[PDB]
């Protein structure tokens, strides 16, 4: 059922495709609000009414629950790539979101340009955000490699500053399997190819 490097063409989009909704347009607008709040003038007296508006909007959203809830994909249990997660979730305003494709050699790849909510050192991506993105990519690389495992250990190494506001290439690949034990590796590079962050993860199942 789930797409893997053996049953799907190279370039198969693994994350959720744009559908033109609706809720995705609203989530994009929320992401835009999140960005703007970090840049806005904090002395703006209008922020009082803006908070009322945002709270009003949230109240509306809360009062409109879906009649039939969509299932949550447990990717780490072999159910396919997740759609609700804080890295790639289209309806998750925490997610950039990252778009990922599976390639013929077993690797998974995407490019993301990150913005100020993701900031740690001035002008650069928080080292923890780099870890979050890489963790998720390894999960997707495992799905695409036809394997499933619970995260056991992540070892992240930081080589060069990771900048905001420019294209970062995320890549992951399942490297080996020994029984229940899966080893997966990935990195984040700038457009010139230089590695900023790399990771080795160990998984079980």
């Amino acid at each position: 059922t789930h797409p893997t490097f053996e049953n799907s063409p190279s370039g198969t989009v693994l994350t959720s495709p744009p559908d033109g909704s609706a809720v995705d347009r609203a989530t994009d607008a929320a992401r835009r609000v999140v960005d703007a709040l970090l840049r806005t003038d904090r002395g703006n007296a209008n922020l009082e009414r803006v908070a009322e508006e945002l709270n009003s909007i949230a109240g509306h959203l809360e009062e409109h629950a879906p009649a039939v809830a969509e299932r949550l994909i447990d990717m780490w249990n072999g159910e396919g790539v997740t759609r609700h997660d804080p890295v790639t979730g289209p309806e998750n305003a925490l997610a950039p979101p990252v778009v990922l494709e599976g390639l013929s050699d077993g690797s998974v790849r995407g490019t993301v340009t990150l913005t100020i909510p993701y900031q740690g050192p001035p002008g650069h991506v928080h080292g923890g955000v780099s870890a979050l993105l890489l963790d998720h990519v390894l999960g997707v690389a495992n799905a695409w490699g036809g394997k499933a495992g619970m995260t056991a250990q992540l070892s992240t190494r930081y080589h060069r500053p990771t900048p905001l506001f420019e294209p970062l290439t995320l890549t992951g690949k399942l490297m080996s399997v020994d029984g229940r034990k899966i080893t997966t590796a990935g990195d984040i590079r700038t457009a010139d190819g230089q590695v900023c962050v790399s990771v080795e993860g160990l998984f079980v199942d």
Copy 2:
């Protein structure tokens, strides 16, 4: 502030206020959560997106000429206020509130919500890593040291649940030349370690 010069219980981060940017951010956090639970078929989402865009336009148009200065915690400038773990005006942050303790450790308690979900009902492993990474930077600051991150080794012991109080703790463990070694963990209310970390930083 460092455990040398400051009392146990010193709040280290900048927790949200009743004022006006913090209340707007808190309200944005509420929207973010609601979007993940709401009816995708609700026809009103058309107007909701228009309002959020209108709000964003307002916030964008009400911005200073020069952006506000940032605290570079990793370069010894103090604790960050802009980050996606503790920043009161960063709607990506839960936010986590951290305090410094006499023994040199830092600690905070957080209840995580559905935007942070990985496995169903549970915190994304990468979110645990993020939270821990920042906690280690703060622990270094409270210990009066600072270095850029070199390596973070994160071990997952037990599942980390959403919707309940989690304790985050970090402490600078040693300094050996340029190398700073820092450790921490996330524990449930019963004290059990869900996730632990060891970080190496280079001054």
